[PDB]
């Protein structure tokens, strides 16, 4: 697969607590399908390093589905990025 067009994502389910200590979300994609999703997260203070620990391996958009993403994030102020689609995620705890 090729990489999903970073400009063609929208939120279907915004990032939310999963009930088992993870962050789940769902996106819709409006480019060529199928494709591999570029998903990352960035901590305030370090714009270069992907801090998202993916539980869903190799997330993809298929023709008939895909777009569910599950991850864990470090404590503090983060931003989640699916392509260029973004959402803040402040992670409580330690």
């Amino acid at each position: 697969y090729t990489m999903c067009d970073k400009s063609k994502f929208a939120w279907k389910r915004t990032p939310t607590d999963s009930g088992h200590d993870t962050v789940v979300m769902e996106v819709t994609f409006s480019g060529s399908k199928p494709c591999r999703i570029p998903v990352r997260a960035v901590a305030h203070g370090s714009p270069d390093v992907n801090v998202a620990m993916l539980i869903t391996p190799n997330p993809t958009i298929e023709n008939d589905g895909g777009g569910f993403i599950e991850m864990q994030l470090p404590p503090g102020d983060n931003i989640i990025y699916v392509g260029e689609l973004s959402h803040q995620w402040f992670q409580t705890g330690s």
């Epitope: 067009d5 970073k6 409006s30």
Partner: antibody
Framework: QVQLQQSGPELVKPGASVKMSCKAS????????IGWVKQRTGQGLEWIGE????????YYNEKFKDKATLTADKSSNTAYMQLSSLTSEDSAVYFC?????????????WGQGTTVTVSS | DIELTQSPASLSASVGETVTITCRAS??????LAWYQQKQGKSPQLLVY???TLADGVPSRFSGSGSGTQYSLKINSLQPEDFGSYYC??????????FGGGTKLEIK
């Protein structure tokens, strides 16, 4: 250079169907989306839909999903739009245009337009 | 859906002068804004993409700017070939890739 060559005018009765073509040359057909745009005389541009020839993926404007059908033929580097059940509301110029598959941010080259005139 | 509202609807100006026309989006489109010029009876021509990048062959007297929901196209030193209708279009995140209603520039 990039060229999108569209087919000739269609003067048809209400209720007819038409199929127009858009032949691409000067680039790799499957690396670029083909979008279609409607323009009534003296009015603005309207996005109909698009096809990714490399994958077959299509997107349709909700207002046209019962009116337009988009297909593509990789072997002939040709994209097709079919319009069904024509009314006078369908009389317009229809353009095909090219965008980049994978970072689709503009219709960067445009065909010359196919005029459809629905007439008694 | 995103609505794009272009302003002014029409304007008349003279060769050599400057004009500014604008395109307002109903939601944030993250600079995914393209500008086209269309002469009467001709096909649209891409002028600007990603709100500020000139397309190939477009002269530097065109400049695109803006962000968020507000975008501007400025034409310095108008030339006779600059008449026509100008349209904006967005490509952010989900179709329809709607067009603004157009601005008609007449060279006085």
């Amino acid at each position: 250079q990039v060229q999108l060559q569209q087919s000739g005018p269609e003067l048809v009765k209400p209720g007819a169907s038409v199929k127009m073509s858009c032949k691409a040359s000067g680039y790799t057909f499957t690396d670029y989306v083909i979008g279609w745009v409607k323009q009534r005389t003296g009015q603005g541009l309207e996005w109909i839909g698009e096809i990714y020839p490399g994958s077959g993926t299509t997107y349709y404007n909700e207002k046209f999903k019962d009116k337009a059908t988009l297909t593509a033929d990789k072997s002939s580097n040709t994209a097709y739009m079919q319009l069904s059940s024509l009314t006078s509301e369908d009389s317009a110029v229809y353009f095909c245009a090219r965008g980049e598959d994978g970072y689709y941010i503009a219709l960067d080259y445009w065909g010359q337009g196919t005029t459809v005139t629905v007439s008694s | 859906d995103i609505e794009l509202t272009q302003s002014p609807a029409s304007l008349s100006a003279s060769v050599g002068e400057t004009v500014t026309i604008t395109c307002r989006a109903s939601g944030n489109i993250h600079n995914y804004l393209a500008w086209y010029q269309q002469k009467q009876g001709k096909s649209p021509q891409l002028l600007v993409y990603k709100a500020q990048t000139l397309a190939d062959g477009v002269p530097s007297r065109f400049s695109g700017s803006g962000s968020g929901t507000q975008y501007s196209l400025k034409i310095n030193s108008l030339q006779p070939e600059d008449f026509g209708s100008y349209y904006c279009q967005h490509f952010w995140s989900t179709p329809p890739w709607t067009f603004g209603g157009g601005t008609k520039l007449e060279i006085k």
